[PDB]
């Protein structure tokens, strides 16, 4: 018998991104080669199968720094982290291959699917 | 907003 | 030039509620008279002006237990915590006054507004 | 789903 506030989930996500921008209660640093990204573990886990597996591990759940594979492109990771916090994906000809590879690694299927579609359309 | 979901 | 995944924010919220149900990475207990509720500080802060003020305080941000005013109804708090994590509000004739009072205390304006509307319609 | 926001 519940009523539902349509904009609630998007407002929560906007507010989580505002906390990230102000560095409020961020609890992990993701390191991608020479670059560092501060984030909230729960948001990473709610978006990515890889982060869900990492932060449910009894030892890794306690880590404050996670180093990604050196093959991962920092710009590709930045674009996906922004997508996690905003639902918006800055997909461009110049970054699509790095974004797709990063989304495969992070196990973000919806992103992998749109990248495949955009690549197929250019063929 | 509010709706019947 | 971004593309947007429409269902992303709702999927994130559903996944945060799945983490709450399994008690994964919950970092605070809210105590309401004899009742305890485990939650994630970032979700509380993203939904409630009161929790935003609490967890941005330099001393209270470190607390693992927060005790609410004894006047707050535990069922009213449970309904609002479920709304935070799902966008669904279980508003009923038998709970509307407790829900409205709890939403005023938690500074959740959209909930206060719908309660006022439902009360006014019954007059 | 994907759209132009
Ligand atoms: C639920 C609302 C409550 C008020 C609020 N105020 C601010 S800034 C101070 C101000 O505007 N008052 C910020 C920020 N940054 C946030 C947010 F990050 F969580 F989104 C919220 C969440
Ligand atoms: C982004 C996705 C990745 C896979 C995943 N799996 C599970 S349960 C194990 C399984 O189904 N595999 C749970 C739970 N509970 C969650 C979630 F809580 F975060 F939502 C996620 C988030």
**Cβ atoms C39, C17 nearer than 8 A:** no
| SS3 per residue for chain A | CCEECCCHHHHHHHHHHHHHHCCCCCCEEEEECCEEEEECHHHHHHHCHHHHHHHCCCCHHHCCEEECCCCCCHHHHHHHHHHHHHCEECCCCCCHHHHHHHHHHHCCHHHHHHHHHHHHHHC
| SS3 per residue for C78-120 | HHHHHHHHHCEECCCCCCHHHHHHHHHHHCCHHHHHHHHHHHH
> Is A13 near ligand 1, meaning CB less than 6 Å away?
no
Output the CA A49–ligand 2 centroid distance in Å: 7
Which method was used? Answer: X-ray
**Cβ atoms C89, C83 nearer than 8 A:** yes
Question: Relative to the alpha carbon of A21, which ligand is closest?
Answer: 1
Residue with CA nearest ligand 1 atom 17: A15
Q: Considering its fold, how many domains does chain C have in total?
A: 1
CA dihedral of C83, A14, C41, C76, whole degrees rounded to 10 = -20
* Closest to C47 in 3D by CA, of C100, C3, C110: C110
Domain of A6, in residue numbers: 1-123
List the structure tokens of C107. 């500074």
Output the CA A120–ligand 1 centroid distance in Å: 42
Pocket test residue of A42, A46, A48, A52 for ligand 2, highest count of atoms within 8 A of CB: A52
Q: List, in order, residues 6 or more apart from A101 with CB less than 8 Å away.
A: A71, A72, A73, A76
Name the closest residue on chain A to residue D1, using Cα atoms.
Answer: A110
């Amino acid at each position: 018998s519940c009523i539902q506030f349509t904009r609630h989930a998007s407002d929560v996500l906007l507010n989580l991104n505002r906390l990230r921008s102000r560095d409020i209660l961020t609890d992990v640093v993701i390191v991608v080669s020479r670059e560092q990204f501060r984030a909230h573990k729960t948001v990473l886990m709610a978006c990515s199968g890889l982060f869900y597996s990492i932060f449910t591990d009894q030892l890794k759940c306690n880590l404050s720094v996670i180093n990604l594979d050196p093959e991962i492109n920092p710009e590709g990771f930045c674009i996906l982290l922004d997508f996690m916090y905003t639902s918006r994906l800055n997909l461009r000809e110049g970054n699509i291959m790095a974004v797709m590879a990063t989304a495969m690694y992070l196990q973000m299927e919806h992103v992998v699917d749109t990248c495949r579609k955009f690549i197929k359309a250019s063929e | 907003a509010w709706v019947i979901p």
